[PDB]
Coordinates of C-alpha atoms in Angstrom, one line a residue:
Chain A
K10 CA 142.6 80.2 107.6
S11 CA 141.8 83.3 109.2
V12 CA 144.7 84.1 112.2
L13 CA 143.7 83.2 116.0
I14 CA 145.8 84.6 118.7
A15 CA 144.6 84.4 122.5
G16 CA 145.7 83.3 125.9
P17 CA 146.1 85.7 129.3
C18 CA 147.8 89.0 129.6
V19 CA 151.0 88.0 132.0
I20 CA 151.7 84.3 132.9
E21 CA 150.9 84.1 136.3
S22 CA 151.9 80.8 137.2
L23 CA 152.6 76.9 134.9
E24 CA 148.8 75.6 136.5
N25 CA 146.7 79.6 135.7
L26 CA 148.7 78.7 132.1
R27 CA 147.5 75.3 131.4
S28 CA 144.3 75.8 132.8
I29 CA 143.6 78.4 130.1
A30 CA 145.2 76.4 127.3
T31 CA 142.8 73.9 128.7
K32 CA 140.2 76.4 127.7
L33 CA 141.2 77.4 124.5
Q34 CA 141.4 73.5 122.5
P35 CA 139.0 73.3 120.9
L36 CA 139.3 77.2 119.4
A37 CA 142.4 75.5 119.0
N38 CA 141.4 72.6 116.8
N39 CA 138.5 74.5 114.6
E40 CA 140.6 73.6 110.4
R41 CA 139.1 76.9 109.6
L42 CA 141.8 79.0 112.2
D43 CA 145.4 79.7 112.1
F44 CA 145.6 79.7 115.6
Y45 CA 148.5 81.0 118.0
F46 CA 147.9 80.6 122.1
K47 CA 149.7 83.8 123.3
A48 CA 151.8 85.4 127.3
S49 CA 153.9 88.1 127.5
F50 CA 156.6 87.2 129.8
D51 CA 156.7 90.6 131.5
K52 CA 155.4 93.3 131.8
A53 CA 157.0 95.7 131.6
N54 CA 155.0 98.5 132.2
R55 CA 152.9 97.9 135.5
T56 CA 151.0 100.6 137.4
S57 CA 153.4 100.7 140.6
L58 CA 156.7 99.5 141.8
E59 CA 155.1 96.5 143.5
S60 CA 152.5 94.8 140.6
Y61 CA 153.4 91.7 139.8
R62 CA 156.8 91.3 137.2
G63 CA 156.0 88.3 135.3
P64 CA 158.3 85.6 135.3
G65 CA 161.1 86.9 133.1
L66 CA 162.1 85.8 130.0
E67 CA 164.3 82.6 131.4
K68 CA 161.3 81.1 133.6
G69 CA 158.4 82.6 131.0
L70 CA 159.9 80.8 128.1
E71 CA 160.4 77.4 130.2
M72 CA 156.3 77.9 130.3
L73 CA 155.4 78.4 127.0
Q74 CA 157.5 75.3 125.4
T75 CA 156.0 73.5 128.2
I76 CA 152.2 74.6 127.0
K77 CA 153.3 74.4 123.1
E78 CA 154.9 70.5 123.9
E79 CA 151.5 69.5 126.0
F80 CA 149.0 71.2 124.0
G81 CA 150.4 71.4 120.8
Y82 CA 149.9 74.9 120.3
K83 CA 151.7 77.9 118.0
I84 CA 153.3 80.3 119.8
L85 CA 153.5 84.6 120.0
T86 CA 155.0 86.5 122.6
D87 CA 156.3 89.6 123.0
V88 CA 159.2 91.4 122.9
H89 CA 160.7 94.4 124.7
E90 CA 164.6 94.8 124.1
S91 CA 166.1 93.6 121.4
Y92 CA 168.2 90.9 122.7
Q93 CA 165.4 88.6 123.7
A94 CA 164.2 88.4 120.1
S95 CA 166.5 85.3 119.6
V96 CA 165.8 82.9 121.9
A97 CA 162.6 84.2 122.3
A98 CA 162.5 83.1 118.9
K99 CA 163.4 79.2 119.6
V100 CA 159.9 78.7 121.6
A101 CA 157.1 82.0 119.8
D102 CA 156.3 81.2 116.6
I103 CA 155.7 85.1 116.3
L104 CA 157.5 87.6 118.0
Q105 CA 155.4 90.9 118.1
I106 CA 156.6 94.1 119.1
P107 CA 154.0 96.0 121.1
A108 CA 152.4 99.4 119.9
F109 CA 155.0 102.1 121.9
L110 CA 158.0 100.2 120.7
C111 CA 157.1 100.1 116.7
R112 CA 159.3 102.4 115.5
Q113 CA 162.2 101.0 117.0
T114 CA 164.5 99.8 114.2
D115 CA 167.5 98.0 116.2
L116 CA 164.3 96.1 117.8
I117 CA 162.7 95.6 114.3
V118 CA 165.9 94.4 112.9
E119 CA 166.0 91.7 116.1
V120 CA 162.8 90.5 115.6
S121 CA 163.2 90.2 111.8
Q122 CA 166.6 88.6 112.1
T123 CA 165.4 85.5 113.6
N124 CA 162.7 82.7 111.6
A125 CA 159.6 84.3 113.1
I126 CA 157.0 85.6 112.2
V127 CA 157.0 89.2 113.7
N128 CA 153.1 91.0 114.5
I129 CA 154.4 94.7 114.4
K130 CA 150.9 96.8 116.7
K131 CA 150.3 100.2 115.9
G132 CA 151.4 103.1 117.6
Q133 CA 147.9 104.5 119.2
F134 CA 149.4 108.3 118.0
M135 CA 150.3 106.3 114.1
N136 CA 149.1 107.0 110.5
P137 CA 148.4 103.8 110.1
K138 CA 150.1 104.7 106.3
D139 CA 153.3 105.5 108.2
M140 CA 153.5 102.0 109.1
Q141 CA 154.5 101.3 106.6
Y142 CA 157.9 101.8 107.3
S143 CA 158.2 99.6 109.8
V144 CA 157.0 97.6 107.7
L145 CA 159.9 98.0 105.3
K146 CA 162.8 97.5 108.0
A147 CA 161.3 94.2 108.4
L148 CA 161.0 93.1 104.7
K149 CA 164.3 94.6 104.1
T150 CA 166.6 93.2 106.7
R151 CA 165.0 89.3 104.9
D152 CA 164.8 90.2 101.6
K153 CA 167.5 93.5 100.6
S154 CA 165.8 93.4 97.9
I155 CA 162.3 94.8 98.8
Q156 CA 161.8 98.7 98.2
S157 CA 158.4 98.7 98.5
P158 CA 156.1 96.6 101.0
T159 CA 153.2 95.6 100.1
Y160 CA 150.9 92.3 101.0
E161 CA 151.6 90.0 98.8
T162 CA 155.8 90.3 99.8
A163 CA 154.7 90.7 103.9
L164 CA 153.0 87.6 103.9
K165 CA 155.1 85.2 101.6
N166 CA 157.9 87.5 104.7
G167 CA 156.2 86.6 107.8
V168 CA 155.5 89.7 108.6
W169 CA 152.0 91.7 109.6
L170 CA 150.9 95.1 110.9
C171 CA 148.0 94.7 114.2
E172 CA 145.7 97.0 114.8
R173 CA 145.4 98.5 118.6
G174 CA 143.1 101.5 118.5
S175 CA 144.4 105.0 118.4
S176 CA 144.5 107.7 121.2
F177 CA 141.5 109.7 121.5
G178 CA 141.8 112.6 123.5
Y179 CA 143.1 111.6 127.3
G180 CA 141.9 108.3 128.3
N181 CA 139.8 107.4 125.2
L182 CA 140.9 105.3 122.7
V183 CA 139.4 104.7 118.9
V184 CA 139.4 102.2 116.2
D185 CA 139.7 103.5 112.6
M186 CA 138.1 101.3 111.2
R187 CA 139.7 103.2 107.4
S188 CA 143.1 101.7 109.4
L189 CA 142.2 98.0 108.9
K190 CA 142.3 99.0 104.9
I191 CA 145.1 100.7 104.9
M192 CA 147.3 99.0 106.8
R193 CA 146.3 96.0 104.2
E194 CA 147.9 97.3 100.9
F195 CA 151.5 96.6 103.4
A196 CA 150.8 93.4 105.2
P197 CA 148.1 91.1 107.0
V198 CA 146.1 92.8 109.4
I199 CA 145.1 91.7 112.8
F200 CA 143.0 92.9 115.1
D201 CA 143.4 93.3 118.6
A202 CA 140.1 93.6 120.1
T203 CA 141.0 93.4 123.6
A204 CA 142.9 96.3 123.6
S205 CA 141.3 98.2 122.3
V206 CA 137.9 98.7 124.1
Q207 CA 138.6 101.8 126.9
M208 CA 136.1 104.8 127.5
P209 CA 136.2 106.5 131.2
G210 CA 133.7 106.9 133.4
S221 CA 133.0 94.5 126.1
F222 CA 132.4 96.4 122.9
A223 CA 135.3 93.9 121.8
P224 CA 132.1 91.4 120.8
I225 CA 130.5 94.7 118.2
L226 CA 134.6 96.0 117.4
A227 CA 135.8 92.7 116.7
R228 CA 132.1 91.9 114.8
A229 CA 133.3 95.9 112.7
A230 CA 136.6 94.5 112.1
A231 CA 135.9 90.8 110.4
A232 CA 133.2 93.2 108.0
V233 CA 135.9 95.1 106.8
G234 CA 138.0 92.5 106.3
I235 CA 140.8 91.6 108.6
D236 CA 143.2 88.1 108.7
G237 CA 142.8 88.1 111.8
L238 CA 142.0 88.1 115.4
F239 CA 143.9 89.3 119.1
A240 CA 141.8 89.0 122.1
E241 CA 143.3 88.1 125.7
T242 CA 141.1 85.7 127.3
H243 CA 141.5 84.7 130.8
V244 CA 139.5 81.5 132.8
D245 CA 138.4 83.9 134.8
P246 CA 139.3 87.6 134.6
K247 CA 138.6 89.2 138.3
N248 CA 141.4 87.0 139.4
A249 CA 143.8 88.0 137.0
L250 CA 147.2 89.6 137.8
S251 CA 146.9 92.7 135.6
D252 CA 144.9 95.1 135.6
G253 CA 141.9 92.8 134.8
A254 CA 138.7 95.1 132.6
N255 CA 140.7 94.2 129.3
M256 CA 140.0 90.5 128.9
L257 CA 137.6 88.0 127.6
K258 CA 136.2 84.6 128.9
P259 CA 136.3 81.7 126.8
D260 CA 132.6 80.7 126.6
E261 CA 132.4 84.3 125.3
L262 CA 135.6 84.6 122.7
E263 CA 133.7 81.3 120.9
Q264 CA 130.7 83.4 120.1
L265 CA 133.1 86.4 119.2
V266 CA 134.7 84.0 117.3
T267 CA 131.3 82.3 115.8
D268 CA 130.6 85.8 114.6
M269 CA 133.6 86.1 112.7
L270 CA 133.9 83.4 111.1
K271 CA 130.2 83.6 109.3
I272 CA 130.3 87.5 108.3
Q273 CA 133.8 86.1 107.1
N274 CA 131.8 83.8 104.7
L275 CA 129.4 85.9 102.9
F276 CA 132.6 88.2 101.9
Chain B
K10 CA 167.7 130.1 138.4
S11 CA 165.9 128.7 135.3
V12 CA 167.8 125.6 133.5
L13 CA 167.4 126.0 129.9
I14 CA 169.0 122.7 128.3
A15 CA 170.2 123.1 124.8
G16 CA 172.0 121.5 122.3
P17 CA 171.9 119.1 118.9
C18 CA 169.7 116.6 118.0
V19 CA 172.2 113.7 117.1
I20 CA 176.1 113.6 117.8
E21 CA 177.4 114.4 114.1
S22 CA 180.7 114.4 115.0
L23 CA 183.5 116.5 117.4
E24 CA 184.0 119.4 115.9
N25 CA 180.3 119.8 115.3
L26 CA 179.5 120.1 118.7
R27 CA 182.8 121.9 119.1
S28 CA 181.1 124.1 117.3
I29 CA 177.1 124.5 118.3
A30 CA 179.1 124.2 121.9
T31 CA 180.9 128.3 120.7
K32 CA 177.5 129.5 119.7
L33 CA 176.0 128.3 122.8
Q34 CA 178.8 130.0 125.2
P35 CA 176.9 133.2 125.6
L36 CA 173.6 130.9 127.2
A37 CA 175.4 128.7 129.2
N38 CA 177.4 132.1 130.5
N39 CA 173.8 133.6 131.1
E40 CA 173.7 134.1 135.1
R41 CA 169.8 134.0 135.3
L42 CA 169.6 130.1 133.8
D43 CA 171.7 126.6 135.1
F44 CA 172.6 125.6 131.5
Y45 CA 172.8 122.2 130.1
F46 CA 174.3 121.0 126.9
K47 CA 172.2 118.4 125.1
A48 CA 172.8 115.5 122.3
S49 CA 171.7 112.0 121.8
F50 CA 174.4 109.5 121.3
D51 CA 171.7 106.8 118.9
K52 CA 168.8 108.1 117.2
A53 CA 166.5 104.7 117.9
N54 CA 163.6 105.8 115.3
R55 CA 165.3 106.9 112.8
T56 CA 162.7 105.8 109.7
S57 CA 164.7 104.2 107.7
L58 CA 167.5 101.1 108.0
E59 CA 169.6 103.4 106.7
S60 CA 169.2 106.9 108.0
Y61 CA 172.5 107.8 110.1
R62 CA 171.9 106.6 113.9
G63 CA 174.7 108.6 116.1
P64 CA 178.1 107.4 116.7
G65 CA 176.6 104.8 120.5
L66 CA 176.5 105.4 123.6
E67 CA 180.5 104.6 123.8
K68 CA 182.0 107.0 121.5
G69 CA 179.2 109.3 122.5
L70 CA 179.9 109.3 126.3
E71 CA 183.3 109.6 125.3
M72 CA 182.4 112.8 122.8
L73 CA 180.3 114.4 125.5
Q74 CA 183.0 114.4 128.3
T75 CA 185.6 115.9 126.0
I76 CA 182.6 118.7 125.9
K77 CA 182.3 119.1 129.6
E78 CA 185.9 119.2 129.6
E79 CA 186.5 122.1 127.2
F80 CA 183.7 123.8 127.7
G81 CA 182.8 123.2 131.9
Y82 CA 179.1 122.0 130.2
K83 CA 177.4 120.1 132.7
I84 CA 175.7 117.4 130.0
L85 CA 172.0 115.4 129.4
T86 CA 171.5 112.6 127.2
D87 CA 169.0 110.1 127.0
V88 CA 168.7 106.8 127.2
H89 CA 166.8 104.2 125.5
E90 CA 167.8 100.4 126.8
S91 CA 168.7 98.5 129.4
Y92 CA 172.1 99.2 131.3
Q93 CA 173.2 102.5 129.6
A94 CA 172.0 104.5 132.4
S95 CA 175.1 103.9 134.7
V96 CA 177.6 104.3 132.6
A97 CA 175.6 107.4 130.9
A98 CA 175.7 108.8 134.1
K99 CA 179.4 109.2 134.8
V100 CA 179.9 111.3 131.8
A101 CA 176.0 113.4 132.2
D102 CA 174.1 114.7 135.3
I103 CA 170.6 114.7 133.6
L104 CA 169.5 111.8 132.1
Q105 CA 166.6 111.7 129.8
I106 CA 163.5 109.3 129.5
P107 CA 162.2 109.5 126.2
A108 CA 158.9 110.3 126.0
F109 CA 157.2 106.9 124.2
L110 CA 159.1 105.5 127.3
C111 CA 157.4 107.4 130.3
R112 CA 155.3 104.6 131.9
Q113 CA 158.4 102.0 131.0
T114 CA 158.6 101.6 135.2
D115 CA 162.6 99.3 135.1
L116 CA 163.9 102.3 133.5
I117 CA 162.9 104.7 135.6
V118 CA 164.2 102.7 138.5
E119 CA 167.0 102.0 136.5
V120 CA 168.2 105.7 135.7
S121 CA 167.0 106.7 139.2
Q122 CA 169.7 104.9 140.9
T123 CA 172.3 106.2 139.8
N124 CA 173.7 109.9 140.9
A125 CA 172.3 111.9 138.0
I126 CA 168.8 113.9 138.2
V127 CA 166.0 112.3 136.1
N128 CA 163.3 114.7 132.9
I129 CA 160.7 111.7 132.3
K130 CA 159.5 113.3 128.8
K131 CA 155.6 113.3 129.3
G132 CA 153.7 110.5 126.2
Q133 CA 152.4 112.2 123.5
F134 CA 148.5 111.2 125.3
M135 CA 149.5 111.2 128.7
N136 CA 147.1 112.8 130.8
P137 CA 149.0 114.4 132.3
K138 CA 148.1 113.9 136.0
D139 CA 149.1 110.3 135.3
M140 CA 152.9 110.9 135.2
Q141 CA 152.4 111.8 139.1
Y142 CA 152.9 107.7 138.8
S143 CA 156.3 107.8 136.6
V144 CA 157.4 110.6 139.3
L145 CA 156.2 108.2 142.5
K146 CA 158.2 105.5 141.0
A147 CA 162.1 108.0 140.4
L148 CA 161.5 108.7 144.0
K149 CA 160.4 105.7 145.6
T150 CA 163.6 104.2 144.5
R151 CA 165.4 107.0 145.9
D152 CA 163.4 107.1 149.2
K153 CA 160.9 104.7 150.4
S154 CA 158.9 106.5 152.7
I155 CA 157.6 108.1 149.5
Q156 CA 154.2 107.5 149.0
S157 CA 153.1 110.9 147.2
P158 CA 155.0 113.0 144.4
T159 CA 155.1 117.3 145.5
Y160 CA 157.1 119.7 143.9
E161 CA 159.2 120.0 146.9
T162 CA 160.4 116.6 146.8
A163 CA 160.5 116.2 144.3
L164 CA 163.3 118.7 143.2
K165 CA 165.1 117.9 146.3
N166 CA 165.4 114.6 144.4
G167 CA 166.6 115.9 141.0
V168 CA 163.1 114.2 139.5
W169 CA 162.0 116.3 137.0
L170 CA 158.5 115.6 134.2
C171 CA 159.2 118.0 130.6
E172 CA 156.0 118.8 128.7
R173 CA 156.5 117.6 124.5
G174 CA 153.1 118.5 123.0
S175 CA 150.4 116.2 123.2
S176 CA 149.2 114.2 119.9
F177 CA 146.3 116.1 118.5
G178 CA 144.0 113.6 115.1
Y179 CA 146.9 112.1 113.2
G180 CA 150.3 113.6 112.2
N181 CA 149.6 116.8 114.6
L182 CA 150.7 118.3 117.8
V183 CA 149.6 120.4 120.1
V184 CA 150.4 122.3 123.6
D185 CA 147.5 121.6 126.0
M186 CA 149.6 124.3 128.3
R187 CA 147.2 123.6 132.1
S188 CA 149.6 120.8 131.7
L189 CA 152.2 122.6 132.7
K190 CA 150.2 123.8 135.8
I191 CA 148.8 119.9 136.8
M192 CA 152.3 118.6 136.4
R193 CA 154.2 121.4 138.0
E194 CA 152.2 120.2 141.4
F195 CA 154.2 116.9 141.5
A196 CA 157.2 117.6 139.9
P197 CA 159.7 120.9 138.8
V198 CA 159.0 121.2 134.4
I199 CA 160.1 121.8 131.6
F200 CA 159.2 122.7 128.4
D201 CA 160.7 121.0 125.4
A202 CA 159.8 124.3 122.8
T203 CA 160.7 122.4 119.7
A204 CA 158.9 119.6 119.8
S205 CA 157.0 118.8 116.4
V206 CA 155.4 115.7 115.0
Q207 CA 157.7 113.8 113.3
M208 CA 156.9 113.0 109.3
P209 CA 157.8 108.8 108.2
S221 CA 159.4 128.2 114.3
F222 CA 156.0 128.1 116.5
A223 CA 158.9 127.6 119.5
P224 CA 159.2 131.5 119.9
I225 CA 155.3 132.0 120.5
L226 CA 155.1 129.0 122.6
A227 CA 158.2 129.4 124.8
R228 CA 156.9 132.4 125.6
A229 CA 153.1 130.9 126.5
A230 CA 154.4 128.1 128.2
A231 CA 156.2 131.1 130.1
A232 CA 154.0 133.4 131.4
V233 CA 151.7 129.6 132.3
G234 CA 155.1 129.1 134.5
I235 CA 157.8 127.0 134.8
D236 CA 161.9 125.7 135.3
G237 CA 163.2 125.9 132.8
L238 CA 163.5 125.4 128.4
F239 CA 165.1 122.6 126.8
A240 CA 165.3 123.7 122.7
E241 CA 167.1 121.9 119.9
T242 CA 170.0 124.0 118.1
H243 CA 172.3 123.7 115.9
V244 CA 174.6 126.1 114.0
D245 CA 173.5 125.2 110.9
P246 CA 170.2 123.6 111.1
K247 CA 169.6 122.5 106.3
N248 CA 173.4 120.5 106.6
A249 CA 171.9 118.8 110.3
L250 CA 171.6 115.0 109.8
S251 CA 168.6 115.0 111.7
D252 CA 165.8 116.6 112.1
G253 CA 167.2 119.8 109.3
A254 CA 163.4 121.2 110.2
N255 CA 162.9 122.4 114.3
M256 CA 166.3 123.2 115.4
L257 CA 166.1 127.1 116.2
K258 CA 169.5 128.7 115.4
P259 CA 171.4 130.2 118.0
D260 CA 170.6 133.9 117.8
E261 CA 167.2 132.8 118.4
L262 CA 167.6 130.8 121.1
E263 CA 168.7 133.8 122.9
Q264 CA 166.3 135.2 121.7
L265 CA 163.7 132.6 122.9
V266 CA 165.8 132.5 126.8
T267 CA 165.8 136.8 126.9
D268 CA 161.7 137.1 126.6
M269 CA 161.3 134.3 128.6
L270 CA 163.7 135.7 131.5
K271 CA 161.5 139.2 131.2
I272 CA 157.7 137.3 131.8
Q273 CA 159.3 135.0 134.1
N274 CA 161.0 138.5 135.8
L275 CA 156.8 140.1 135.8
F276 CA 156.0 136.8 138.3

């Protein structure tokens, strides 16, 4: 089963969450997918001081819980501080390490001491080869006999790596498709199609197809019922219909190989 | 006075700290410098689980305060997480935000709520023009009326920017000297001459380069005996090397 992780960037309100959850119900019941609903409870890196923060840990997890109960969804959320990990793992089936935190030992350790799947996003200037060390800190926490990380051992131990692009000059993101293959020696690989589109002066579908042709274990996409009215920078996100098409195309590609 | 911030990467032991402190006395007493001694109480991004962590906030701060007392040095240290800032600032004269955290709003706000000077390292893939937003968050915290960040305003309220290079492909780092000028419009600029790509000498040359462009200070990792440094024993300067580098900067700055 290919993994699909999908939902809005940040939790905005219970009704917005219910709305997007509802639009994703057909994807979630697709027996070819292993589905996880996502939303951040905090926006730690917001553009400016008065920018929307999100509801915070306690109210945000209550909300993700309600989605899990009403829709039957497994949940992914991300964690920025060690001491969030334990309580978040009681609602989230996956805990995500943000890309900028991907070398933070204590965070990785704490998250790995929980029972959740650990999804480590690759830093924007990290060499994909160096992501083995982050996988290994997690694996060693879960099984202190492991000396080197492998796909099969990371899979049995619930540790995954996520491609979100590399910085390319100032204000540009490029996806080196080679990294998908390289990181897959170490762990299952998820492709974040909506992070990685950014050029100065949508590409998400075409990169998702490229990624599926190379070989990925799953897809991650930020999705909103109405991007123009989102409380993020609304530029990165797909509509549900757009995501359905993208997923349709990935499965056809994957079924060739 | 130009700022010099110098000390080891991490607190190894009290005697090691005392030893590096002693060797920095000549630079600490230099009439042309505004000197701060630094060292991290925690190394948050070590490449292995077994690797040395540093002594932790409590004990590390206690060690730095001892240096402050014994040597009369003002202190810089870095903060990595919530609820460190206020306690760190009882000892540290400068609180530093590491480069990968340079856009973390809550961390900026929290550090800026203390009495400390705030040193914001530029992210390895940040456009220097975008550092103006980090400065403004810190500035607004200290004075709500400020709408746009400026050198004069950042200097008065103790918010500095620090250049540490930009990622250039994989496993390589490049200093865009233009960033020194660009960032200086927003705040005083320190150049981190020991900036190096971590791997999971050109320092004097870049320092002279940066002094010629225009900087408000220099930051350098320094160790008495780098080969026996608990981390990272590859990129630090020896005390005498730092002196040479400081000499050349002052001469270049004296032309202007």
